[PDB]
Design an enzyme around this catalytic site. Structure first.
Site, PDB file in Angstrom:
ATOM      1  N   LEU A 191       0.658  -1.370  -0.142  1.00 28.50           N
ATOM      2  CA  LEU A 191      -0.119  -0.001  -0.069  1.00 28.50           C
ATOM      3  C   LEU A 191       0.648   1.354  -0.012  1.00 28.50           C
ATOM      4  O   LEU A 191       0.428   2.329  -0.545  1.00 28.50           O
ATOM      5  CB  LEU A 191      -1.086  -0.095   1.212  1.00 28.50           C
ATOM      6  N   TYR A 213       9.942   5.041   6.852  1.00 26.70           N
ATOM      7  CA  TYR A 213       9.230   4.860   8.197  1.00 26.70           C
ATOM      8  C   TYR A 213       8.606   3.630   8.512  1.00 26.70           C
ATOM      9  O   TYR A 213       8.227   3.460   9.684  1.00 26.70           O
ATOM     10  CB  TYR A 213       8.154   6.005   8.245  1.00 26.70           C
ATOM     11  N   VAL A 233       4.084  -0.627   4.496  1.00 28.25           N
ATOM     12  CA  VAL A 233       2.682  -0.958   4.915  1.00 28.25           C
ATOM     13  C   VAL A 233       2.163  -1.874   3.699  1.00 28.25           C
ATOM     14  O   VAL A 233       2.402  -1.550   2.704  1.00 28.25           O
ATOM     15  CB  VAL A 233       1.931   0.193   4.960  1.00 28.25           C
ATOM     16  N   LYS A 242       1.883  -3.328   9.297  1.00 23.50           N
ATOM     17  CA  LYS A 242       3.103  -2.355   8.975  1.00 23.50           C
ATOM     18  C   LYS A 242       4.270  -3.063   9.435  1.00 23.50           C
ATOM     19  O   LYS A 242       4.468  -3.232  10.741  1.00 23.50           O
ATOM     20  CB  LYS A 242       2.598  -1.211   9.908  1.00 23.50           C
ATOM     21  N   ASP A 283       1.856  14.646  14.612  1.00 24.52           N
ATOM     22  CA  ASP A 283       1.969  14.442  13.243  1.00 24.52           C
ATOM     23  C   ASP A 283       0.667  14.522  12.686  1.00 24.52           C
ATOM     24  O   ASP A 283       0.490  13.728  11.618  1.00 24.52           O
ATOM     25  CB  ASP A 283       2.743  13.141  12.895  1.00 24.52           C
TER      26      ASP A 283
HETATM   27  O1  LIG Z   1      -0.357   3.188  11.789  1.00 24.43           O
HETATM   28  C1  LIG Z   1      -0.187   3.271  10.514  1.00 24.43           C
HETATM   29  O2  LIG Z   1       0.734   3.519   9.936  1.00 24.43           O
HETATM   30  C2  LIG Z   1      -1.357   2.656   9.476  1.00 24.43           C
HETATM   31  C3  LIG Z   1      -2.698   2.337  10.084  1.00 24.43           C
HETATM   32  C4  LIG Z   1      -3.530   2.011   9.131  1.00 24.43           C
HETATM   33  C5  LIG Z   1      -2.989   1.609   7.849  1.00 24.43           C
HETATM   34  N1  LIG Z   1      -1.895   1.908   7.269  1.00 24.43           N
HETATM   35  C6  LIG Z   1      -0.895   2.562   8.206  1.00 24.43           C
END
Ligand SMILES: O=C(O)c1cccnc1
Lengths: 330, 5
Positions: free
Chosen positions: A44, A49, A52, A67, A155
């Protein structure tokens, strides 16, 4: 003499009154799940960082989001885990479903409930007047909850707001920069995104609090009702304060500095100068006039302030007349 | 091929 201390106007001593187990994330023991219960499907997003992914829990045939955490410090990895567990069950807060370990490389991975991979950024420049009021109120629900739990997100930005426009649900995600608030603590000013850094981060005032998220929220609101993305578009951290001063004026900037006895960086003096305050009506043209109202400008003016103590809290913001129609519809 | 093969 040193800069003048400061404290939050709300939820000041919540973490001090909590048991040490609540905010001592370093002493937190992680209960690991079974990584073999999930099968990755597609990626995704990337970036420095985390990686995902979208996966499927083959145990109950439910979609999930995984993640992959980066080889960062374990000290920060336990902090995000502890913050996600303390907030589990809150309104519009992302729910941590599971935490697994790579059997080979021992790399941690967080498993969340499935969310439509549509962040607020791909939708907030195309919303109606009522949609802005509604979604701002939902973002306020998440902010007021985590603030009441002694946690500041640090953030807030459209990319960190997942939205399901069809079912009108919203989730605040990415708590990797979140931190527990303790009075008198001096935090790192290199947090949040450039276009959403508050003036206290730009002038290096380390004793900030929950009001940092309210500035970032004000930047999102200004970006929506004015159809200008981003509202403060600086080319670096120093220029970011210049773009803010071009709108809010330098008079209130230097008064804010003299109040807290902030030692401003000498390089700002060569790029600041004098700027008068521009009224919010001056940003209204024919393409955004239907999204701007006297209640929107009054609510925005009370969010984008230099003095972090003068900004509205998350609780005070919900009681603003800007959300009267939305609250009555609940 | 990736947690489950
Ligand atoms: O907390 C995140 O980084 C997150 C949460 C849902 C989906 N994608 C990332």
């Amino acid at each position: 003499s040193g800069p003048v201390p400061s404290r939050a106007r709300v939820y000041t001593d919540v973490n001090t009154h909590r048991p040490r187990e609540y905010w001592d994330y370093e002493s937190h023991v992680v209960e690991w799940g079974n990584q073999d219960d999930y099968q990755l499907v597609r990626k995704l997003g990337r970036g420095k960082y985390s990686e995902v992914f979208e996966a499927i829990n083959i145990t109950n045939n439910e979609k999930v989001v995984v993640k992959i955490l980066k080889p960062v410090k374990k000290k920060k990895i336990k902090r995000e885990i502890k913050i996600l567990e303390n907030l589990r069950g809150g309104p519009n807060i992302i729910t941590l479903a599971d935490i697994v370990k790579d059997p080979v490389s021992r790399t941690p991975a967080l498993v969340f409930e499935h969310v439509n991979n549509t962040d607020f950024k791909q939708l907030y420049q195309t919303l109606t007047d009522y949609d802005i009021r509604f979604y701002m109120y939902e973002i306020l629900k998440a902010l007021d909850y985590c603030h009441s739990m002694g946690i500041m997100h640090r953030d807030v930005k459209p990319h960190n707001v997942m939205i399901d426009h069809e079912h009108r649900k919203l989730r605040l995600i990415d708590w990797g920069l979140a931190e527990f608030y303790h009075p008198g603590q001096e935090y790192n000013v290199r947090v949040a995104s450039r276009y959403f850094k508050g003036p206290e981060l730009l002038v290096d005032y380390q004793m900030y609090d929950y009001s940092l998220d309210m500035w970032s929220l004000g930047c999102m609101l200004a970006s929506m009702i004015f159809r200008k993305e981003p509202f403060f578009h600086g080319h670096d951290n120093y220029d970011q304060l210049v773009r803010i001063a071009k709108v809010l004026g330098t008079e209130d900037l230097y008064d804010y500095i003299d109040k807290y006895n902030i030692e401003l960086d000498p390089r700002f003096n060569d790029i600041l100068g004098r700027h008068s305050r521009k009224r919010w009506e001056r940003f209204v043209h024919s393409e955004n006039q239907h999204l701007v109202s006297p209640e929107a400008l009054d609510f925005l003016d009370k969010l984008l302030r230099y003095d972090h103590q003068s900004r509205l809290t998350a609780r005070e913001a919900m009681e603003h007349p800007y959300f009267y129609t939305v609250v009555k519809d609940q | 091929p990736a947690x489950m093969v």
